Amino acid sequence: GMRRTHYAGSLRETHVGEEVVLEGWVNRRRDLGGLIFLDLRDREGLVQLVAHPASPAYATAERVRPEWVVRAKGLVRLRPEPNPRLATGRVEVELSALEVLAEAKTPPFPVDAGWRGEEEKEASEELRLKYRYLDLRRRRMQENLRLRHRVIKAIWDFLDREGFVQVETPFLTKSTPEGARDFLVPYRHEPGLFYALPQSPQLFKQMLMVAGLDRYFQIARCFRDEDLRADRQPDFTQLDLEMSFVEVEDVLELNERLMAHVFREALGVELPLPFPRLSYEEAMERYGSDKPDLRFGLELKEVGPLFRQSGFRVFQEAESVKALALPKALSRKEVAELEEVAKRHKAQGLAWARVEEGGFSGGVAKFLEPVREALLQATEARPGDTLLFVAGPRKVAATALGAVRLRAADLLGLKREGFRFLWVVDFPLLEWAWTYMHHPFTSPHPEDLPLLEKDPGRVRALAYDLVLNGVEVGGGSIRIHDPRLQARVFRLLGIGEEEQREKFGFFLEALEYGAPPHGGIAWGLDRLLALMTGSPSIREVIAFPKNKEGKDPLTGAPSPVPEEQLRELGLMVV
Amino acid sequence: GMRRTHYAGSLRETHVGEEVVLEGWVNRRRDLGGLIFLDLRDREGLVQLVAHPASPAYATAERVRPEWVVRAKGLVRLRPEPNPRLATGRVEVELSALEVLAEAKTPPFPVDAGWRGEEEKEASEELRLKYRYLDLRRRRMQENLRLRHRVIKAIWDFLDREGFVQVETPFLTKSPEGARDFLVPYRHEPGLFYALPQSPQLFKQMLMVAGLDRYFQIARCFRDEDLRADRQPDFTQLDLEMSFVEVEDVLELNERLMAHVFREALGVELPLPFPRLSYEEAMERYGSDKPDLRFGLELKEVGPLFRQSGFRVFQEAESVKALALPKALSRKEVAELEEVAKRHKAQGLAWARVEEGGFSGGVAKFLEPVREALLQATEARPGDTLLFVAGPRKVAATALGAVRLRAADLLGLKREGFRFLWVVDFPLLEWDEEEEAWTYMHHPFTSPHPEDLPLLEKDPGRVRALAYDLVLNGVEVGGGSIRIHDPRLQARVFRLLGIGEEEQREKFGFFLEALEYGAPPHGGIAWGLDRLLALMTGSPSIREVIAFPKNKEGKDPLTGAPSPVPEEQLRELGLMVVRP
Ligand SMILES: N[C@@H](CC(=O)O)C(=O)NS(=O)(=O)OC[C@H]1O[C@@H](n2ccc(=O)[nH]c2=O)[C@H](O)[C@@H]1O
Ligand SMILES: N[C@@H](CC(=O)O)C(=O)NS(=O)(=O)OC[C@H]1O[C@@H](n2ccc(=O)[nH]c2=O)[C@H](O)[C@@H]1O
Fold it and tell me: How far is the CA of B390 from the centre of ligand 2 (A)?
């Protein structure tokens, strides 16, 4: 068996009197009163070792240095005074033996403070990535990686109980000139031919439905060689799943229970079911975003039809006027800050007014008095609030005041806590020629089918986004399983036969052999884990990520190769 | 919820009288006296639907052809005569409604026989791969994929319980397991490439340096080999690593894990512990470092018996290995084994016969002078054939071991069940008989035996390694080792393997630096998951347990990969194809 009797961090008062053998890293050394104190560290926490002058381990304990690997043997004793900041805080190990298994260079940054329950000073992330094997020693990084383990195991437990089959799909697959750029992999035996890394398992998981497996899932790696701004990594992890004989409601209900199971098991958090649902239109109208942050209120209100008789030209002639009531009298500085946020989102400006006990004052207050009673009933505003207005095209006015709404939450210091999931449903299928939103296999709404050719912009898709605290963490749809409907959607998009066969030939042929009704979703697992941990970047929930630029400071990739290794592939740099 | 009330194949007589809603594929249709019988198929199997001419479902049922997708509603009733070949064979569904969800054209090969319990005729594997989404409809393929799911879930259950942390490691990493790298061009700086990982070896050791203590991953490995011997461009490993372990700790945990996997996924009890043979023991007794323990016929050393023999080819040889087969082979069969032997670098194969008193055939004349000792050493009986290979010890063992394996097939020995074993105490270096050079058996991070450290400079060929292979039925299904955690020793072993300081820094500098920050003792292993699943299912190829595999030339008939890309796309990477 092993030489150690326990994880160092697992010792408690229940272990007093036992002789233990421990192995780990020297977190810190302190000399007090002629005793040598060593914080011994492993993944379960710190435990205090004490060397007394008479002990055989005394000289060894004096020479050891931070991050040295040691094996320690001694008796578990009670501390005279407990340190409540350690789970082992009531006990210590009186050393009889101490053996050095590895010395260590002074690390480029400290990794010891979190294990004592102390705040850790921010270090250069580039430094942290270059020495990531040391960065991963820190308590916070190990908790993130172990939560990610618990989340994936919980996904496995749940989906296995619900009859899902995990299926692993190819990594070396067909490159298509369709949309997002592929990472390529040269085929050595025939120069000029390339595999591609997969953008997602979409076509394979649909083909697994055509194969009759009924329900599938995979913790899938997706590779997309595009802009790496906005926290993107060159590859990321999805929870990918697909089901047969389902409606939208079936997919949402399954994913709700799975998510609630994941949060209960991996975080100890209870998520009330069902999640709230909002159509795309409702989300845009009430929050100005298709990923609403539900951790605070302050909904947008359409007040356009209140000013159709008002002399205020800019309100009267606008297609939309959105209003927002902030529960605070803003400074002129804050208003101009919100105005700049609005103008940065294509708005012509931001009108404003304070609401007093009898009327309004400031900004556009004069033009608000004739409609006072109606305006207050629509906005539910009270004396002391500030009313913000954006007038313009409907999408612009909503999106601009929605961004104002988010920035206003920070100005007001609103407490945004917990986890607020919601479904955004009934997205438009297309957008102006015409083009689809995600991928062309998304089914139109059955009752909107006749509008496909008549009024395409009004056609709803059977697609849905999962949103958590203003962040898209999941997206999916019911798929087309009728090849004639799929051809009909292609004819509407202007996508000819030669283009279909080149991009999708093998899958379109698959639909001719009896595809069941099916649909699915993929979660952004790294995004979910970052949100579950309050991390500012998905880099904090990935063991060995790339930096914001796409490179790996730890190993140096991407790096050149000997020209003989490249000549062997039949390629050269131009 | 769902329209569907049950899986089609799950109906039993306990459901008789219930009204059910079912969804699935038409396995087959036959018409009889106006009735329309549809075998409805889903992942649980077949159930018979009956459409009566008086039913509203009848008009729909008349359009239906095989592989059409339908939703059916009706009442479960007993069949007048039951079909004992089906789990639903006692019942049928009297249809009250039927709707076509999807039509289908005739598949290029049948998928229906297996769901009836009937034998499936062999289809061209290239055609099966081209229509892999239809091939995956067959019962055997779904059984394979569902078994694959059960095996991985069992691995998660066991290792999670044992405190292992699953960590996912990079796919776009730095350009080491004895193969060529698959490269990925870095678009922004032409001339820069990522490499796909041949294994997660260095990342999992760094996870030990990070203090995670025990790791696992169901990892995808990419190795650009001459894809002979059923190689796929990428394959799947159960990868794992542990800290503060000796060889025995790694072996015992894997044994218990495998026994759990087989128990939960196959219902098979594997007796523990696994047998253990050293590399030298396995090579002496079986002529192979991956012995097949499903039959006997062990190899015997008889060289010391011929030191007074007139047969110079025996008398000069370092080794003469003998094997006694319980059969009088034909001369054709002997020549076949001789050809096998010669294909494995042997100088030849000798033969004879054991008869009631004397010997007959082949080299029997030179065997007669040494009879008493030979029969005690070989345990040969009348009617047997004795075979010999003479030569250097490793050649003689390997050649007669390959003869041994072939002879098991010629003799029709019933080799059954699952016979695991560990092979341990591998030498640090392997002698390439061809290139006349020392190479490492396992990757350069394998720790030599600590007792042998002074031999690294004094006598490298005597150095043992803390490495081990897991063998199942003569197939290498796992391999691992205790690692080097001292940076001085790791450079010392790099020096031995012919890797100067310049090559060390350029390929492994980041990792040697990590060893300077207090690396713990650690070791681990990796299973060949596709290999194991192929063996668990008796499949002849790992392609039978991979959902969408490549063909033997590493190509995907289903998708057309690998394929050309637009000249514009290759231009953007700053690369061009060399003109021949
Ligand atoms: N095959 C379809 C899913 C389906 O229809 O079933 C698909 O991939 N959709 S997707 O592109 O929206 O990604 C699905 C989800 O993946 C996450 N994500 C996406 C891009 C990225 O860089 N990081 C990231 O975490 C994000 O949460 C998104 O909602
Ligand atoms: N990094 C070490 C593991 C360790 O030392 O912990 C490693 O990869 N070793 S390995 O290369 O032998 O693969 C480990 C195992 O992977 C399987 N296999 C290998 C190559 C291949 O093409 N198909 C296949 O199935 C095979 O069973 C082998 O025993």
Answer: 33
Instruction: Round to whole Å and give the CA distance between A567 and B513.
Output: 31
Across the interface, which of A3, A69, A170 has its CB nearest the CB of B548?
A170
Are the beta carbons of B544 and B144 closer than 8 angstroms? Answer: yes
Chain A: residue whose CA lies nearest to B575: A573
Ordered by where they begin, the domains of chain A are 1-107 (2.40.50.140), 138-278+417-574 (3.30.930.10), 279-416 (no CATH)
**What spatial distance separates the first Cα and last Cα of chain B, rounded to whole Å?**
62
> Which residue minimizes the CA distance to atom 25 of ligand 1?
A524
The 3-state DSSP class for residue B421 equals strand
Residue with tokens 């556009």: A364
The total of other beta-carbon atoms located within 10 Å of residue A56's CB is 12
Instruction: List all residues 6 or more positions away from A434 whose beta carbon is below 8 Å from its beta carbon.
Output: A456, A492, A493, A494
Q: What is Dmax (Cα atoms) for chain B?
A: 96
Does residue A459 contact residue A451 with C-beta atoms inside 8 Å?
yes
Integer Cα distance of B39 and B37 in angstroms: 7
Token pair for A351: 């009108």
Starting from the CA of residue A442, give the closest ligand: 1
To which residue do tokens 């002058």 refer? A53
Euclidean distance between CA atoms B37 and B50, whole angstroms: 5
Give the pairing type, strands B353-354 and A91-102.
Answer: unpaired
Cα(A219)–Cα(A166) distance, integer angstroms: 8
Alpha-carbon gap, residue A326 to A412, rounded angstroms? 8
Q: Which residues of B touch A482 (CB under 8 A)?
A: 102
Chain B neighbours among A 172-211 (CB < 8 Å)? 172-175, 177, 181, 183-197, 204, 207-208, 210-211
Q: How far apart are CA A305 and CA A321, in angstroms?
A: 8
Looking at the DSSP assignment, which residues form a beta bridge with residue A40? A26, A47
- Give the experimental resolution in Å: 2.2
Token digits of residue B160: 């999670």
CA distance A512 to A481: 9
Which three-class secondary structure state does DSSP give residue B233? coil
The string of DSSP codes covering B87-127 is TTTTEEEEEEEEEEEE-BPPPSS--SGGGGTPPPPPPPHHH
Instruction: Choose among A415, A403, A416: nearest CA to A337.
Output: A403
Q: Smallest Cβ distance to A142: which of B206, B212, B575?
A: B212
Task: Output phi, psi for A451, to 5 deg.
Answer: -80, -5
Q: Is B140 a known ligand-binding residue? A: no
* Nearest alpha-carbon partner for B481 in B497, B468, B494: B468
**To 5 degrees, how large is the angle CA A200–CA A150–CA B208?**
95
